[PDB]
Amino acid sequence: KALEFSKPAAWQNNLPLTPADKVSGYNNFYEFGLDKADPAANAGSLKTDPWTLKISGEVAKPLTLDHDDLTRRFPLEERIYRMRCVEAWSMVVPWIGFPLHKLLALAEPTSNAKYVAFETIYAPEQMPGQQDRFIGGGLKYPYVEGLRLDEAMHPLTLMTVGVYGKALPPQNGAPVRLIVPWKYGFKGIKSIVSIKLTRERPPTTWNLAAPDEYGFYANVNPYVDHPRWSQATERFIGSGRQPTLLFNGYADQVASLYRGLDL
Ligand SMILES: Nc1nc2c(c(=O)[nH]1)N[C@@H]1C(S)=C(S)[C@@H](COP(=O)(O)O)O[C@H]1N2
Ligand SMILES: [W+6]
């Protein structure tokens, strides 16, 4: 479904784009199966409209948004970001959405709020992966993720509601999905149902599944490898190899957040 959005020059560029059919044909969405083609083939069984997105926790004005809100409450913008999955493949995608800080501003987070916890919809009857230990990759469902508050407020982190000029296909995490371009793809949680501001660091699906391989921060870094493969290089998914950049190329926009700190 086509939709209206602006094209801020800050997020417009000359990066060669990943074809739309690959953006929505090569996916990781375990709730619909482990294979890259499983989501495009099975995600159609998920009902994305009506939708309820609930903002709560250490917030002063907890609110809830319906499906129409996702595309009208805030002005939409197209941003051409690179998307680097931890498995060493990457894409350049023209997402569409609104910065997460505009949403958090409405809820007005309290002085105790330190982290943001996200949760994906739970519908075992529409999601085959939520029923088979191997089909769903053995992940503890529903999928959960979190960000430190300053990360969630960064102007780069996007609440994504569409791609390539149109609403998001279900395989891409329709109707609302998270995108943090400087981190590995698993941080970009799909089909969000809940956003909670918390005082402590929330749990993370992949870090719970393998604490030794997937960290909480997961910043794209070519110098720190994955226990089972190097992160120095990556397969660009174009039509039909390149070195991985620090923070996936947004180092000068995000380095500030991590200077002088550990992990
Ligand atoms: N709910 C949910 N969100 C998710 C996943 C998932 O399996 N379930 N996998 C992802 C991982 S590991 C990647 S690399 C990206 C992929 O987004 P895309 O399919 O739209 O490219 O989504 C992340 N978000
Ligand atoms: W990934």
Swiss-Prot record:
<dbReference type="GO" id="GO:1901530">
    <property type="term" value="P:response to hypochlorite"/>
</dbReference>
<keyword id="KW-0479">Metal-binding</keyword>
<dbReference type="GO" id="GO:0030091">
    <property type="term" value="P:protein repair"/>
</dbReference>
<protein>
    <recommendedName>
        <fullName>Protein-methionine-sulfoxide reductase catalytic subunit MsrP</fullName>
        <ecNumber>1.8.5.-</ecNumber>
    </recommendedName>
</protein>
<keyword id="KW-0560">Oxidoreductase</keyword>
<keyword id="KW-0732">Signal</keyword>
<feature type="binding site">
    <location>
        <position position="120"/>
    </location>
    <ligand>
        <name>Mo-molybdopterin</name>
    </ligand>
</feature>
<feature type="binding site">
    <location>
        <position position="85"/>
    </location>
    <ligand>
        <name>Mo-molybdopterin</name>
    </ligand>
</feature>
<keyword id="KW-0500">Molybdenum</keyword>
<feature type="binding site">
    <location>
        <position position="172"/>
    </location>
    <ligand>
        <name>Mo-molybdopterin</name>
    </ligand>
</feature>
<dbReference type="GO" id="GO:0016675">
    <property type="term" value="F:oxidoreductase activity, acting on a heme group of donors"/>
</dbReference>
<dbReference type="GO" id="GO:0016672">
    <property type="term" value="F:oxidoreductase activity, acting on a sulfur group of donors, quinone or similar compound as acceptor"/>
</dbReference>
<feature type="binding site">
    <location>
        <position position="27"/>
    </location>
    <ligand>
        <name>Mo-molybdopterin</name>
    </ligand>
</feature>
<comment type="function">
    <text>Part of the MsrPQ system that repairs oxidized periplasmic proteins containing methionine sulfoxide residues (Met-O), using respiratory chain electrons. Thus protects these proteins from oxidative-stress damage caused by reactive species of oxygen and chlorine. MsrPQ is essential for the maintenance of envelope integrity under bleach stress, rescuing a wide series of structurally unrelated periplasmic proteins from methionine oxidation, including the primary periplasmic chaperone SurA and the lipoprotein Pal.</text>
</comment>
<dbReference type="GO" id="GO:0046872">
    <property type="term" value="F:metal ion binding"/>
</dbReference>
<dbReference type="GO" id="GO:0030288">
    <property type="term" value="C:outer membrane-bounded periplasmic space"/>
</dbReference>
<comment type="similarity">
    <text>Belongs to the MsrP family.</text>
</comment>
<feature type="binding site">
    <location>
        <position position="177"/>
    </location>
    <ligand>
        <name>Mo-molybdopterin</name>
    </ligand>
</feature>
<keyword id="KW-0574">Periplasm</keyword>
<feature type="binding site">
    <location>
        <begin position="30"/>
        <end position="31"/>
    </location>
    <ligand>
        <name>Mo-molybdopterin</name>
    </ligand>
</feature>
<comment type="subunit">
    <text>Heterodimer of a catalytic subunit (MsrP) and a heme-binding subunit (MsrQ).</text>
</comment>
<dbReference type="GO" id="GO:0043546">
    <property type="term" value="F:molybdopterin cofactor binding"/>
</dbReference>
<feature type="binding site">
    <location>
        <begin position="188"/>
        <end position="190"/>
    </location>
    <ligand>
        <name>Mo-molybdopterin</name>
    </ligand>
</feature>
